[PDB]
Amino acid sequence: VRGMNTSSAMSAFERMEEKVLMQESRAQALGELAGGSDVD
Amino acid sequence: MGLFDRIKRVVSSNLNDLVNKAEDPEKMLEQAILEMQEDLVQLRQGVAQAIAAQKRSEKQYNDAQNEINKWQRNAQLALQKGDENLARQALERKKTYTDTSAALKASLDTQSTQVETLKRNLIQLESKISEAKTKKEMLKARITTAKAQEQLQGMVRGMNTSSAMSAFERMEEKVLMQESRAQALGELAGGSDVDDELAAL
Amino acid sequence: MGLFDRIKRVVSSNLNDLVNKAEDPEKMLEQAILEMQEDLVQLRQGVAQAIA
Amino acid sequence: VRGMNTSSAMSAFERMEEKVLMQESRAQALGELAGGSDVD
């Protein structure tokens, strides 16, 4: 399960998952920072 | 609080951050999956032993049941050949087998329930590992999305995250400066009249 | 969790990905088949003893 | 059997099988990405 750390394998898996999500969030924020009615 | 506790907390907080920098997502995801599967394999064998023990218990139950009828047949053979002595003695002994049959079936039932629960758990674990194996590919897709978006931002004029854009903009500015030099040199050393025709037509 | 466990997990995750890059399908398929057949041969002999 | 890894030979065989299927899927996706009533 996501929220418990009894197993080392899940610990590592979730840690890498969070690292990658953070990296993508960094990319998105950098996108924002530097910068359908009509077709409806 | 203490002092040795504090020193060891500092040393640990340094070593852990040293390690967490070496971890690389693309490889540790696979390593986690590999160990996941190893553990599942080692659980299969426990389930197998449970099943084998159930087979043994049912076989014992069947054999006791068969001996019950065997001794009933022995009683009938006594009735055919012998007398009431052997005929009654056969059932006298058959008492024990009738007892043991139920005494064993009671536990055989619980054993069966346990084996069923174990099989269910094994299937659940297989499903969850498959889900994780899909999540790994989804995470790789996210990595690619991140790198693509970072590529796009490097294309904007005012930021220097990408070396290619750095060089491109540098040459652009150099050339604009050269043209400005030419224009200034032009100035340094050195439409009302034709708008009248617009009145003609 | 532990620390030595974590270090060894990192080292293992590196060596395994190093090896999995060397594997080439066209050859490892044949190698797997070859060992498959070897095992079958070694089982024939057990069956033969049973028959004898 | 496909889903269990008790034998090393099968482990390797299935691993190569999945690698090749993934390679073919890559080719097909690359085909899509870059781009019978009438004869009935």
Author numbering:
A (entry chain A), D (entry chain A): 156 to 190, 203 to 207
B (entry chain A): 1 to 190, 203 to 213
C (entry chain A): 1 to 52
Copy the relevant paper text.
The ESCRT-III-like protein Vipp1 couples filament polymerization with membrane remodeling. It assembles planar sheets as well as 3D rings and helical polymers, all implicated in mitigating plastid-associated membrane stress.
Specifically, Vipp1 and a Vipp1 interface 3 mutant, Vipp1-F197K/L200K1, were assembled using equivalent helical parameters and lattices and were termed Vipp1L1 and Vipp1F197K/L200K_L1, respectively. Vipp1F197K/L200K_L1 was resolved to 3.7 Å overall using helical parameters of a rise of 2.44 Å and a rotation of –75.83°, which were almost identical to those of Vipp1L1. Overall, Vipp1F197K/L200K_L1 and Vipp1L1 subunits were in similar conformations and assembled using equivalent helical lattices. Concurrently, the outer leaflet filled the space between the helix α0 stacks. In Vipp1F197K/L200K_L1, the ESCRT-III-like protofilaments were rotated ~43° to the membrane tube axis while maintaining similar lateral interactions and ultrastructure by undergoing filament twisting. Overall, Vipp1F197K/L200K_L1 showed how Nostoc punctiforme Vipp1 helical filaments have the capacity to tubulate membrane, as reported in other Vipp1 systems.
